[PDB]
Amino acid sequence: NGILSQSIANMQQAEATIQSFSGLPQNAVNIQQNVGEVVAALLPQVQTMQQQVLAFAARLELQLTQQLANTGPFNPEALKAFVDLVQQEIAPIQTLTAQTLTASQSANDRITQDNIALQRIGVELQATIAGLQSNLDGARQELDSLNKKKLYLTGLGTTGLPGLIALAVTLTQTQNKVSSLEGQVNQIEGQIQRQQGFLGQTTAFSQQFGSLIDRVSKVGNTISLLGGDIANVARDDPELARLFFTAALTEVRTLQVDASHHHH
Amino acid sequence: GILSQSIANMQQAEATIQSFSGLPQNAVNIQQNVGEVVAALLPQVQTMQQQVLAFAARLELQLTQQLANTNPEALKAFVDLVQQEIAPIQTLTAQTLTASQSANDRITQDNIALQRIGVELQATIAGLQSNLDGARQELDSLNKKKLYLTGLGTTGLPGLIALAVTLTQTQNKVSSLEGQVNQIEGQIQRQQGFLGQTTAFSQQFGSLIDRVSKVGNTISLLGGDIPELARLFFTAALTEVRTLQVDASHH
Amino acid sequence: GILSQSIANMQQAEATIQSFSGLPQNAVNIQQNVGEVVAALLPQVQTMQQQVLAFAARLELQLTQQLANTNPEALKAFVDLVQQEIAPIQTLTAQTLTASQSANDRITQDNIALQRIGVELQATIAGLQSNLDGARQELDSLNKKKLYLTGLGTTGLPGLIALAVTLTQTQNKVSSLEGQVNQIEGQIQRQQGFLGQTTAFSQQFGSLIDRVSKVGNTISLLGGDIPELARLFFTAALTEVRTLQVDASHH
Amino acid sequence: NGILSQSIANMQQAEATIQSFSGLPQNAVNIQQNVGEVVAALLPQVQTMQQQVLAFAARLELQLTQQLANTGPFNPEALKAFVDLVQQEIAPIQTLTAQTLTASQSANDRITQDNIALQRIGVELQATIAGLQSNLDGARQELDSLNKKKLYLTGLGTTGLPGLIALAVTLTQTQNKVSSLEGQVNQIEGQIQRQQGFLGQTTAFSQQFGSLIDRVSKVGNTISLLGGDIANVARDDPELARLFFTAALTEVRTLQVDASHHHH
Ligand code: NA
Ligand code: NA
Ligand code: NA
Ligand code: NA
């Protein structure tokens, strides 16, 4: 249900489909290996990061409500010890999130470069199929001439037979030239179709990966805003501590929504 | 040869087609159909092709041997022998054509059904994206008010406390609506990927059917007809036998 | 700036959108809608943008002048003056947002209607292509028989005469079915081209709506609120005025 | 209704849509000029060719039925005069058809080359948008650091003010770097969208043009088969003349179907 959970599930499906393709060039094998490693190694690290962010947020949510339950004045030394403890507990979550985002952007950026490289290759197949289509057109014309001469020499008497015995050999050669070019055009059309199908799956994988990266990045941004609220208690009035605790609690609840397993 | 390439392209699309999970019945229908086409029908097309080529090579040599010999009840002892030897191949070819068209036609119907499903999913999003936009705009307004109130110092605390309650409600609404839109978008994307593969499979299957039809037409013509005409007869038949070898070739 | 680019991209799509003829009602609906958006609504978005920027530049200078002066019934003679001067721009912005969403939502509904029409056209072809394949296969068989009979010399004349009659009937059937399939394929192609342009127009319109919403949210916040807090107040307000200039910029 | 009529009508619509595009590169202007010339000059020559093929076929259809109405023997000199007259009447139609096909293939092949050139350009925009996205990502990180230092120095006392007056200038510069890159990414996305739309219309024009070329080519092939039947009368038995006249009449009726204004 949640955006991380969906992106992960969709990426796992795209990856299985991406592995089903054979006979593709090196850039396609580059993506196949990359997505295999993303599904095997990085998506488990994203699930670990999600579990750790939620565990962290649940603990800090109760710590903040307990601070906001304080009546009378905030003892300024109790504040600092708390701010220190929270700053120490944010550090590792903020770090794991930044690391998770970096690993994700690295892998996804390599997919985009391999996709662009495959696209250049697809355009060079379009160029290739357009000379093969001309060669095919011209071998058809060549076969039209030969068959009109066969008409003509078959139209002559005994005088024709020598010329016909010759033309028979040219006709076979030109026919094999036409049948070969039809096979070559069919071949390149199939390669074009297969690569377009593959790029459709790698583009979909990268779109889902992008949704995952944007949500990891949103989680990091909220952790940074949370850090800023908490440090505005350390800068110290008991009503200011209450303002920054209240702001920090909105950010903690934002994390719980953004990193949530299930939507709602 | 086109026939050999069509088979090969059909095998690759079938592996890719089987990789997709979580699709509706109509997609499962195509997955089963293409599994059977690859397991049962393509080997029979390969057998048909071997028999046609073997038969064509034997009849080619025989027609040349006839065009070489130097008898009105000889041209009938032969024509009867050809129409005999050509009967089993004529059968395999008609069966293969009928089975191919039947399987291909079901893919076409399932594909249309999946297109109808996709348009309905797109209509479902349009109905939701409106509400999501609204919720995202309120959430934008609330994030801005949060930064402002926090900047007002203690004067902003009653206002921030009240906003914290509304923020929770709007964040839950945006989360639910995003999750719902994202789910349907994921389904549409998967089905479009699957439809690209099933359309490609069907295009290749069309080429195979066309080639199987061209072969069965040449064979039917050789199997249904009965004295210097013998020469013109053998010359016409031999032109046909040669197109048969080309249409059903392994090139 | 995004707002200026969205407008420009909307103008190009609208010229391309008006170039299409022979489309159903739902396409005509979009053609009229986008004509009015370009003629009436985008000039108003351009007017809104000018007024927002002019208002933001004046209030920015005023907020700096307040942060510079070295009176509890002065902070109210001002706040009342801002909420006054901001009221007309707050109105134009809400109207522009409402008119934009209304026009964009109708494009979305017409687009879905055209997608439903396209899937039905695709279902019509599937029903016909089967019959066309059949007719094309008979025609192939008849063209082959024609070349063969003609090769038999005078023995082939009765057979060619009979085939000439059937050939005419099959050629007329293939011609009718091809023409029908080709007509529907042409319609699908034109509508897909039109849908590419209307989707693009709507994507650009979405960016404009988002930017108009971000502006109206910043303005609403400046227009609804009321002593060293004055300093924090002016500092917060001034951060807002500056985002307003960025969101509504011409860059 | 007929395939020539439909292809022409569809090409006229695609051409109007192709002319509506502005701000595209030289290869797009190459196609705009080409399709303008196809609609202005070549489609009228295709309509003339169609009218001339049908006029020719109607006259030859009646000439062949009148020959087949001959009873008793074909006077071998009457045959030759007829064969000569028909060969003289085919020559100009076979020529106009070949010319029409050549002009069509020339124009269409230039569309395909300009399309491939536009596709190479679209892939170079994909490469360009992927460096702009990184530059944008990095200027966002740069703006995150600056705002965390502003947090920090705002956190210091009077000691902070000098450093803050400096950072204020860096923050403006980095902000203008981010706003500029967002505008540049938006700009290239719009260019990509517009070019894809244009290529969709030029691909459709070329598909319809291809249907026209295949039908012109089919008309030329039938005229060539008709020529071969008619010359097999010139090679001369009254029953052989009847065989080749009957074969020729099937080809004449094929032209009337293939070049037909209305389908059926
Ligand atoms: Na794997
Ligand atoms: Na978050
Ligand atoms: Na023009
Ligand atoms: Na024709």
Author numbering:
A (entry chain J), D (entry chain J): 3 to 132, 134, 134A, 135 to 238, 243 to 270
B (entry chain D), C (entry chain D): 4 to 73, 77 to 232, 244 to 268
Can you provide the manuscript's text about this entry?
We show that the orthologue identified in A. hydrophila (AhlABC) is a haemolytic tripartite α-PFT, requiring all three components for maximal lysis, and we present the structures of the soluble forms of monomeric AhlB and tetrameric AhlC and the decameric pore form of AhlB.
Based on the length of the hydrophobic head of AhlC, its delineating charged residues and the observation that it is not lytic in isolation, we suggest that AhlC inserts into a single leaflet of the bilayer. We thus constructed a triple leucine to threonine mutation (α3 L156T, and α4 L160T, L161T) of AhlC to reduce the hydrophobicity of the head. Haemolytic assays using the triple mutant of AhlC resulted in an almost 80% reduction in activity of the AhlABC complex.
